[PDB]
Amino acid sequence: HMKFFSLADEAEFKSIIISKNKAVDVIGSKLGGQVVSFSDEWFASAENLIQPTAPIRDWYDGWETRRHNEMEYDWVIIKMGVAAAHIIGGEIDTAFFNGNHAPFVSIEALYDEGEEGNIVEDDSRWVEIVEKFECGPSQRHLFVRGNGLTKERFTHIKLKMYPDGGIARFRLYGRVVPPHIIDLAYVCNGAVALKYSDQHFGSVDNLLLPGRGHDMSDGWETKRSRQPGHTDWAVIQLGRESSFIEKIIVDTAHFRGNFPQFITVEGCLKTWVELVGKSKTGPDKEHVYEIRKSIRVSHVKLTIIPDGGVKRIRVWGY
């Protein structure tokens, strides 16, 4: 019942994951995903599986276990960085494991309330959500569950590899369940980056992450453009339709020689209306636009002029 997408068809995969199911990688370290435990890690750390970077050759950039596992499977337990989610799909990348790749993978999940302790492998609450499937050498596998979004919500993921081997990356896509003003554009509140002009370095989904990040690689950055009147833009579905917007924050943290010259922010109800008009931007700073407007919008569009890099956007309201 799992459905797999060719690399040539990643655009269509992203369509389903993001545009239709409003999903994000809920186990990525960049939104606070954490490896809780693992069976084994002999050749290469489990922690590599959730790193934001694409895997590289030169050590192995991945999780790899000892040979001849006497158990049926090796495993890793991962706590999501969001509070809870319904699961739609994922990615397993066996990059550079050319024969010693994981032969088969399955995925289970559970829902835990109290950070009461470190979850164990044989917890009765584990529920299979992706049935066992075959993997190939050194490649990306893009999957969607046959039944679409998981009915129940979950907080923790178990990856099973039968019986042992290597995996470079593991992404798991889910529609976040959000847990008085909030950041309507925050990833943990169900906000998702939908559409973009260009992503040269980083990605638009980085706009909605916790923190101000560490360097340029964890924001959204576009190429140096030359055409007069060029802009770049990013559309964000908010976690909720707004009733009020208090405050918009555009953060150029770490973008020092490549921050946009100007920005605007529009909102719309899914017909775009202005929230922030043309505003001069600076390097490496949180720009705070007080809006204080009773308005009903479902999406925002951030426009950077003519190009450059923004670390985050925050849309405070309710």
Side-chain angles (χ1 to χ4, degrees), residues 20-60:
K20 291 195 213 201
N21 290 274
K22 317 303 179 165
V24 299
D25 176 24
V26 296
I27 65 182
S29 65
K30 73 182 190 181
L31 53 66
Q34 262 151 38
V35 178
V36 177
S37 198
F38 46 85
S39 57
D40 189 71
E41 233 194 12
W42 177 271
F43 287 111
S45 317
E47 224 187 316
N48 292 133
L49 297 169
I50 57 171
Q51 299 305 303
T53 46
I56 53 163
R57 205 16 182 97
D58 206 37
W59 162 260
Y60 247 111

mmCIF file of all heavy atoms in Angstrom, residues 20-60:
data_model
loop_
_atom_site.group_PDB
_atom_site.id
_atom_site.type_symbol
_atom_site.label_atom_id
_atom_site.label_comp_id
_atom_site.label_asym_id
_atom_site.label_seq_id
_atom_site.Cartn_x
_atom_site.Cartn_y
_atom_site.Cartn_z
ATOM 1 N N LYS A 20 -0.874 19.620 -0.553
ATOM 2 C CA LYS A 20 -2.117 18.930 -0.195
ATOM 3 C C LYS A 20 -2.182 18.631 1.293
ATOM 4 O O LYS A 20 -3.190 18.890 1.939
ATOM 5 C CB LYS A 20 -2.295 17.648 -0.994
ATOM 6 C CG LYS A 20 -2.577 17.893 -2.460
ATOM 7 C CD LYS A 20 -3.118 16.637 -3.151
ATOM 8 C CE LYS A 20 -2.661 16.568 -4.603
ATOM 9 N NZ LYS A 20 -3.535 15.682 -5.419
ATOM 10 N N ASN A 21 -1.111 18.092 1.848
ATOM 11 C CA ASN A 21 -1.184 17.603 3.209
ATOM 12 C C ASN A 21 -0.566 18.560 4.220
ATOM 13 O O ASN A 21 -0.593 18.275 5.404
ATOM 14 C CB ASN A 21 -0.561 16.194 3.315
ATOM 15 C CG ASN A 21 -1.394 15.121 2.623
ATOM 16 O OD1 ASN A 21 -2.326 14.550 3.206
ATOM 17 N ND2 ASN A 21 -1.055 14.838 1.381
ATOM 18 N N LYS A 22 -0.026 19.683 3.750
ATOM 19 C CA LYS A 22 0.496 20.740 4.621
ATOM 20 C C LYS A 22 1.548 20.200 5.591
ATOM 21 O O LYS A 22 1.597 20.600 6.762
ATOM 22 C CB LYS A 22 -0.648 21.421 5.399
ATOM 23 C CG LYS A 22 -1.921 21.735 4.569
ATOM 24 C CD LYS A 22 -1.666 22.630 3.326
ATOM 25 C CE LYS A 22 -2.977 22.879 2.526
ATOM 26 N NZ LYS A 22 -2.853 23.998 1.552
ATOM 27 N N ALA A 23 2.393 19.304 5.105
ATOM 28 C CA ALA A 23 3.290 18.577 5.974
ATOM 29 C C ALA A 23 4.719 19.084 5.927
ATOM 30 O O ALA A 23 5.150 19.712 4.949
ATOM 31 C CB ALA A 23 3.271 17.134 5.617
ATOM 32 N N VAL A 24 5.450 18.752 6.993
ATOM 33 C CA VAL A 24 6.856 19.105 7.186
ATOM 34 C C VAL A 24 7.600 17.903 7.774
ATOM 35 O O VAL A 24 6.971 16.968 8.267
ATOM 36 C CB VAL A 24 6.999 20.301 8.151
ATOM 37 C CG1 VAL A 24 6.298 21.551 7.588
ATOM 38 C CG2 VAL A 24 6.445 19.944 9.552
ATOM 39 N N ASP A 25 8.930 17.941 7.723
ATOM 40 C CA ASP A 25 9.780 16.914 8.359
ATOM 41 C C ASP A 25 9.824 17.118 9.878
ATOM 42 O O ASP A 25 10.628 17.917 10.426
ATOM 43 C CB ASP A 25 11.176 16.923 7.751
ATOM 44 C CG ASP A 25 12.126 15.955 8.425
ATOM 45 O OD1 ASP A 25 11.634 14.970 9.041
ATOM 46 O OD2 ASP A 25 13.384 16.110 8.370
ATOM 47 N N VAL A 26 8.950 16.375 10.559
ATOM 48 C CA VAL A 26 8.720 16.588 11.971
ATOM 49 C C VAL A 26 9.819 15.976 12.844
ATOM 50 O O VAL A 26 9.815 16.200 14.054
ATOM 51 C CB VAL A 26 7.345 16.039 12.412
ATOM 52 C CG1 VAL A 26 6.201 16.795 11.724
ATOM 53 C CG2 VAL A 26 7.254 14.514 12.149
ATOM 54 N N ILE A 27 10.719 15.183 12.240
ATOM 55 C CA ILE A 27 11.863 14.601 12.954
ATOM 56 C C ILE A 27 13.202 15.259 12.641
ATOM 57 O O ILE A 27 14.219 14.872 13.231
ATOM 58 C CB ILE A 27 11.992 13.083 12.719
ATOM 59 C CG1 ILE A 27 12.308 12.773 11.250
ATOM 60 C CG2 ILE A 27 10.727 12.398 13.176
ATOM 61 C CD1 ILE A 27 12.396 11.303 10.922
ATOM 62 N N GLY A 28 13.208 16.225 11.720
ATOM 63 C CA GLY A 28 14.426 16.974 11.401
ATOM 64 C C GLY A 28 14.976 17.663 12.639
ATOM 65 O O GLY A 28 14.208 18.233 13.408
ATOM 66 N N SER A 29 16.301 17.606 12.811
ATOM 67 C CA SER A 29 16.990 18.292 13.904
ATOM 68 C C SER A 29 16.808 19.809 13.900
ATOM 69 O O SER A 29 16.908 20.459 14.944
ATOM 70 C CB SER A 29 18.472 17.992 13.844
ATOM 71 O OG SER A 29 19.031 18.526 12.674
ATOM 72 N N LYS A 30 16.557 20.359 12.720
ATOM 73 C CA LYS A 30 16.401 21.803 12.544
ATOM 74 C C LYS A 30 15.101 22.365 13.099
ATOM 75 O O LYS A 30 15.004 23.589 13.226
ATOM 76 C CB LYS A 30 16.540 22.213 11.081
ATOM 77 C CG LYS A 30 15.366 21.851 10.175
ATOM 78 C CD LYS A 30 15.718 22.292 8.751
ATOM 79 C CE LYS A 30 14.576 22.209 7.790
ATOM 80 N NZ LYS A 30 15.074 22.640 6.439
ATOM 81 N N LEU A 31 14.114 21.513 13.405
ATOM 82 C CA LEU A 31 12.991 21.966 14.218
ATOM 83 C C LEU A 31 12.948 21.255 15.565
ATOM 84 O O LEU A 31 11.972 21.328 16.290
ATOM 85 C CB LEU A 31 11.640 21.909 13.476
ATOM 86 C CG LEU A 31 11.147 20.637 12.799
ATOM 87 C CD1 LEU A 31 10.840 19.527 13.828
ATOM 88 C CD2 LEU A 31 9.926 20.927 11.914
ATOM 89 N N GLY A 32 14.039 20.610 15.912
ATOM 90 C CA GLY A 32 14.223 20.103 17.257
ATOM 91 C C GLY A 32 14.018 18.611 17.411
ATOM 92 O O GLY A 32 13.889 18.127 18.538
ATOM 93 N N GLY A 33 13.988 17.887 16.295
ATOM 94 C CA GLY A 33 13.978 16.433 16.330
ATOM 95 C C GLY A 33 15.189 15.882 17.073
ATOM 96 O O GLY A 33 16.292 16.428 16.949
ATOM 97 N N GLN A 34 14.987 14.811 17.836
ATOM 98 C CA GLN A 34 16.021 14.251 18.696
ATOM 99 C C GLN A 34 16.052 12.745 18.663
ATOM 100 O O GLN A 34 15.012 12.092 18.829
ATOM 101 C CB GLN A 34 15.760 14.630 20.143
ATOM 102 C CG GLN A 34 16.538 15.812 20.649
ATOM 103 C CD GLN A 34 15.768 16.552 21.751
ATOM 104 O OE1 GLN A 34 15.095 15.916 22.594
ATOM 105 N NE2 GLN A 34 15.836 17.895 21.731
ATOM 106 N N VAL A 35 17.253 12.203 18.530
ATOM 107 C CA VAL A 35 17.441 10.784 18.700
ATOM 108 C C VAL A 35 17.448 10.449 20.184
ATOM 109 O O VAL A 35 18.301 10.898 20.936
ATOM 110 C CB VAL A 35 18.716 10.270 18.000
ATOM 111 C CG1 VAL A 35 18.879 8.791 18.243
ATOM 112 C CG2 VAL A 35 18.639 10.548 16.486
ATOM 113 N N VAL A 36 16.481 9.628 20.572
ATOM 114 C CA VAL A 36 16.280 9.182 21.937
ATOM 115 C C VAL A 36 17.118 7.960 22.205
ATOM 116 O O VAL A 36 17.759 7.852 23.250
ATOM 117 C CB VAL A 36 14.815 8.767 22.179
ATOM 118 C CG1 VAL A 36 14.619 8.210 23.627
ATOM 119 C CG2 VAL A 36 13.868 9.914 21.883
ATOM 120 N N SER A 37 17.075 7.014 21.276
ATOM 121 C CA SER A 37 17.772 5.762 21.468
ATOM 122 C C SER A 37 18.003 5.014 20.191
ATOM 123 O O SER A 37 17.487 5.381 19.159
ATOM 124 C CB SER A 37 16.982 4.866 22.416
ATOM 125 O OG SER A 37 17.839 3.837 22.928
ATOM 126 N N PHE A 38 18.777 3.935 20.273
ATOM 127 C CA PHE A 38 19.077 3.141 19.095
ATOM 128 C C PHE A 38 19.584 1.802 19.586
ATOM 129 O O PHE A 38 20.023 1.665 20.736
ATOM 130 C CB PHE A 38 20.111 3.859 18.184
ATOM 131 C CG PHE A 38 21.286 4.411 18.955
ATOM 132 C CD1 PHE A 38 22.386 3.601 19.247
ATOM 133 C CD2 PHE A 38 21.258 5.713 19.462
ATOM 134 C CE1 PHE A 38 23.442 4.084 20.012
ATOM 135 C CE2 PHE A 38 22.325 6.204 20.212
ATOM 136 C CZ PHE A 38 23.416 5.380 20.498
ATOM 137 N N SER A 39 19.478 0.813 18.706
ATOM 138 C CA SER A 39 19.970 -0.533 18.960
ATOM 139 C C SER A 39 21.491 -0.594 18.889
ATOM 140 O O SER A 39 22.131 -1.331 19.617
ATOM 141 C CB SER A 39 19.396 -1.498 17.902
ATOM 142 O OG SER A 39 19.712 -1.087 16.582
ATOM 143 N N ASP A 40 22.047 0.149 17.947
ATOM 144 C CA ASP A 40 23.438 0.041 17.570
ATOM 145 C C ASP A 40 23.745 1.204 16.641
ATOM 146 O O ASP A 40 22.851 1.739 16.043
ATOM 147 C CB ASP A 40 23.713 -1.252 16.824
ATOM 148 C CG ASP A 40 25.192 -1.484 16.609
ATOM 149 O OD1 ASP A 40 25.890 -1.786 17.601
ATOM 150 O OD2 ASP A 40 25.757 -1.355 15.511
ATOM 151 N N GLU A 41 25.027 1.531 16.510
ATOM 152 C CA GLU A 41 25.547 2.754 15.900
ATOM 153 C C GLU A 41 27.014 2.488 15.507
ATOM 154 O O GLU A 41 27.796 3.429 15.374
ATOM 155 C CB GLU A 41 25.583 3.824 17.017
ATOM 156 C CG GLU A 41 24.897 5.102 16.698
ATOM 157 C CD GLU A 41 25.223 6.242 17.656
ATOM 158 O OE1 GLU A 41 26.156 6.181 18.481
ATOM 159 O OE2 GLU A 41 24.540 7.258 17.519
ATOM 160 N N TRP A 42 27.417 1.235 15.391
ATOM 161 C CA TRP A 42 28.818 0.901 15.434
ATOM 162 C C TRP A 42 29.673 1.715 14.453
ATOM 163 O O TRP A 42 30.724 2.244 14.834
ATOM 164 C CB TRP A 42 29.060 -0.614 15.245
ATOM 165 C CG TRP A 42 30.513 -0.894 15.215
ATOM 166 C CD1 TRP A 42 31.325 -0.886 14.115
ATOM 167 C CD2 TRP A 42 31.364 -1.125 16.333
ATOM 168 N NE1 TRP A 42 32.628 -1.112 14.480
ATOM 169 C CE2 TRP A 42 32.684 -1.264 15.838
ATOM 170 C CE3 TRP A 42 31.150 -1.246 17.714
ATOM 171 C CZ2 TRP A 42 33.784 -1.510 16.666
ATOM 172 C CZ3 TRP A 42 32.276 -1.515 18.559
ATOM 173 C CH2 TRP A 42 33.565 -1.631 18.023
ATOM 174 N N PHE A 43 29.246 1.809 13.203
ATOM 175 C CA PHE A 43 30.074 2.424 12.162
ATOM 176 C C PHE A 43 29.811 3.909 11.938
ATOM 177 O O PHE A 43 30.669 4.607 11.387
ATOM 178 C CB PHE A 43 29.937 1.669 10.847
ATOM 179 C CG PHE A 43 30.629 0.334 10.849
ATOM 180 C CD1 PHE A 43 29.891 -0.854 10.821
ATOM 181 C CD2 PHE A 43 32.012 0.256 10.879
ATOM 182 C CE1 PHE A 43 30.524 -2.092 10.841
ATOM 183 C CE2 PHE A 43 32.664 -0.990 10.879
ATOM 184 C CZ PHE A 43 31.916 -2.167 10.873
ATOM 185 N N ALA A 44 28.644 4.392 12.348
ATOM 186 C CA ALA A 44 28.245 5.749 12.033
ATOM 187 C C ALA A 44 26.993 6.088 12.814
ATOM 188 O O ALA A 44 26.138 5.222 12.953
ATOM 189 C CB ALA A 44 27.999 5.884 10.543
ATOM 190 N N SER A 45 26.884 7.325 13.306
ATOM 191 C CA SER A 45 25.859 7.686 14.295
ATOM 192 C C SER A 45 24.510 7.791 13.715
ATOM 193 O O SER A 45 24.344 8.404 12.681
ATOM 194 C CB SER A 45 26.097 9.061 14.916
ATOM 195 O OG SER A 45 27.459 9.191 15.221
ATOM 196 N N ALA A 46 23.549 7.303 14.488
ATOM 197 C CA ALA A 46 22.126 7.482 14.247
ATOM 198 C C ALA A 46 21.734 8.938 14.094
ATOM 199 O O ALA A 46 20.854 9.280 13.340
ATOM 200 C CB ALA A 46 21.349 6.849 15.391
ATOM 201 N N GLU A 47 22.414 9.804 14.808
ATOM 202 C CA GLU A 47 22.119 11.239 14.788
ATOM 203 C C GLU A 47 22.235 11.870 13.408
ATOM 204 O O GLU A 47 21.611 12.922 13.150
ATOM 205 C CB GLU A 47 23.075 11.977 15.726
ATOM 206 C CG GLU A 47 22.382 13.001 16.574
ATOM 207 C CD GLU A 47 23.359 13.841 17.367
ATOM 208 O OE1 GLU A 47 24.330 13.238 17.962
ATOM 209 O OE2 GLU A 47 23.138 15.097 17.405
ATOM 210 N N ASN A 48 23.043 11.253 12.543
ATOM 211 C CA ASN A 48 23.196 11.742 11.172
ATOM 212 C C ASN A 48 21.902 11.714 10.376
ATOM 213 O O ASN A 48 21.703 12.557 9.506
ATOM 214 C CB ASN A 48 24.287 10.983 10.414
ATOM 215 C CG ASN A 48 25.684 11.247 10.955
ATOM 216 O OD1 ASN A 48 26.457 10.312 11.172
ATOM 217 N ND2 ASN A 48 26.006 12.504 11.189
ATOM 218 N N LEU A 49 21.011 10.785 10.705
ATOM 219 C CA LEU A 49 19.771 10.565 9.931
ATOM 220 C C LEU A 49 18.902 11.781 9.795
ATOM 221 O O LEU A 49 18.214 11.911 8.783
ATOM 222 C CB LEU A 49 18.914 9.491 10.583
ATOM 223 C CG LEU A 49 19.484 8.089 10.664
ATOM 224 C CD1 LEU A 49 18.639 7.225 11.571
ATOM 225 C CD2 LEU A 49 19.550 7.467 9.296
ATOM 226 N N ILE A 50 18.898 12.648 10.816
ATOM 227 C CA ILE A 50 17.963 13.797 10.859
ATOM 228 C C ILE A 50 18.597 15.156 10.605
ATOM 229 O O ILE A 50 17.912 16.206 10.728
ATOM 230 C CB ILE A 50 17.173 13.862 12.176
ATOM 231 C CG1 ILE A 50 18.091 13.926 13.391
ATOM 232 C CG2 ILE A 50 16.250 12.660 12.321
ATOM 233 C CD1 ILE A 50 17.314 14.220 14.690
ATOM 234 N N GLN A 51 19.884 15.151 10.225
ATOM 235 C CA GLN A 51 20.584 16.410 9.958
ATOM 236 C C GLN A 51 20.008 17.104 8.711
ATOM 237 O O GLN A 51 19.616 16.466 7.746
ATOM 238 C CB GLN A 51 22.119 16.206 9.845
ATOM 239 C CG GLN A 51 22.745 15.663 11.133
ATOM 240 C CD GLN A 51 22.415 16.546 12.377
ATOM 241 O OE1 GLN A 51 22.705 17.764 12.381
ATOM 242 N NE2 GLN A 51 21.786 15.945 13.397
ATOM 243 N N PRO A 52 19.983 18.422 8.735
ATOM 244 C CA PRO A 52 19.416 19.210 7.637
ATOM 245 C C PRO A 52 20.167 19.135 6.301
ATOM 246 O O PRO A 52 19.584 19.403 5.237
ATOM 247 C CB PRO A 52 19.477 20.640 8.176
ATOM 248 C CG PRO A 52 20.425 20.612 9.293
ATOM 249 C CD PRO A 52 20.493 19.259 9.829
ATOM 250 N N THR A 53 21.442 18.792 6.371
ATOM 251 C CA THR A 53 22.322 18.784 5.214
ATOM 252 C C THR A 53 22.035 17.580 4.329
ATOM 253 O O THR A 53 21.464 16.578 4.767
ATOM 254 C CB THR A 53 23.765 18.677 5.693
ATOM 255 O OG1 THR A 53 23.842 17.656 6.693
ATOM 256 C CG2 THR A 53 24.192 19.895 6.474
ATOM 257 N N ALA A 54 22.435 17.674 3.078
ATOM 258 C CA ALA A 54 22.413 16.504 2.215
ATOM 259 C C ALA A 54 23.669 15.749 2.551
ATOM 260 O O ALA A 54 24.661 16.377 2.932
ATOM 261 C CB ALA A 54 22.373 16.889 0.727
ATOM 262 N N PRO A 55 23.643 14.427 2.428
ATOM 263 C CA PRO A 55 24.790 13.614 2.793
ATOM 264 C C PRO A 55 25.944 13.759 1.800
ATOM 265 O O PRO A 55 25.727 14.050 0.614
ATOM 266 C CB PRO A 55 24.243 12.187 2.802
ATOM 267 C CG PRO A 55 22.864 12.243 2.272
ATOM 268 C CD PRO A 55 22.529 13.618 1.903
ATOM 269 N N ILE A 56 27.160 13.579 2.323
ATOM 270 C CA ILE A 56 28.412 13.769 1.569
ATOM 271 C C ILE A 56 29.339 12.570 1.723
ATOM 272 O O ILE A 56 29.179 11.772 2.648
ATOM 273 C CB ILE A 56 29.151 15.055 2.025
ATOM 274 C CG1 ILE A 56 29.355 15.054 3.545
ATOM 275 C CG2 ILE A 56 28.390 16.291 1.601
ATOM 276 C CD1 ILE A 56 30.402 16.038 4.025
ATOM 277 N N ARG A 57 30.324 12.453 0.831
ATOM 278 C CA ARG A 57 31.208 11.299 0.886
ATOM 279 C C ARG A 57 32.284 11.417 1.973
ATOM 280 O O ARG A 57 32.300 10.599 2.914
ATOM 281 C CB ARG A 57 31.783 10.915 -0.483
ATOM 282 C CG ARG A 57 32.191 9.401 -0.600
ATOM 283 C CD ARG A 57 31.603 8.483 0.522
ATOM 284 N NE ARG A 57 31.982 7.061 0.511
ATOM 285 C CZ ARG A 57 32.971 6.498 1.242
ATOM 286 N NH1 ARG A 57 33.766 7.230 2.037
ATOM 287 N NH2 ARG A 57 33.174 5.175 1.164
ATOM 288 N N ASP A 58 33.162 12.410 1.915
ATOM 289 C CA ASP A 58 34.227 12.461 2.936
ATOM 290 C C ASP A 58 34.576 13.865 3.423
ATOM 291 O O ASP A 58 34.950 14.040 4.588
ATOM 292 C CB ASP A 58 35.486 11.740 2.432
ATOM 293 C CG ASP A 58 36.351 11.200 3.579
ATOM 294 O OD1 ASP A 58 35.863 10.712 4.647
ATOM 295 O OD2 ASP A 58 37.611 11.261 3.437
ATOM 296 N N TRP A 59 34.687 7.378 8.602
ATOM 297 C CA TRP A 59 33.533 8.295 8.521
ATOM 298 C C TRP A 59 32.518 7.832 7.472
ATOM 299 O O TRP A 59 32.870 7.372 6.374
ATOM 300 C CB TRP A 59 33.978 9.732 8.208
ATOM 301 C CG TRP A 59 32.867 10.685 7.680
ATOM 302 C CD1 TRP A 59 32.619 11.057 6.351
ATOM 303 C CD2 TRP A 59 31.896 11.396 8.465
ATOM 304 N NE1 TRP A 59 31.560 11.933 6.283
ATOM 305 C CE2 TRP A 59 31.095 12.167 7.559
ATOM 306 C CE3 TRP A 59 31.606 11.455 9.846
ATOM 307 C CZ2 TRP A 59 30.027 12.987 8.003
ATOM 308 C CZ3 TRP A 59 30.548 12.253 10.281
ATOM 309 C CH2 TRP A 59 29.772 13.014 9.366
ATOM 310 N N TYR A 60 31.248 7.953 7.840
ATOM 311 C CA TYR A 60 30.132 7.834 6.904
ATOM 312 C C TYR A 60 29.064 8.802 7.381
ATOM 313 O O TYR A 60 28.795 8.902 8.595
ATOM 314 C CB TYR A 60 29.584 6.436 6.961
ATOM 315 C CG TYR A 60 29.750 5.564 5.746
ATOM 316 C CD1 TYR A 60 30.609 4.449 5.776
ATOM 317 C CD2 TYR A 60 28.970 5.780 4.588
ATOM 318 C CE1 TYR A 60 30.703 3.581 4.661
ATOM 319 C CE2 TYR A 60 29.071 4.940 3.476
ATOM 320 C CZ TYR A 60 29.933 3.840 3.515
ATOM 321 O OH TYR A 60 30.023 2.996 2.425
#
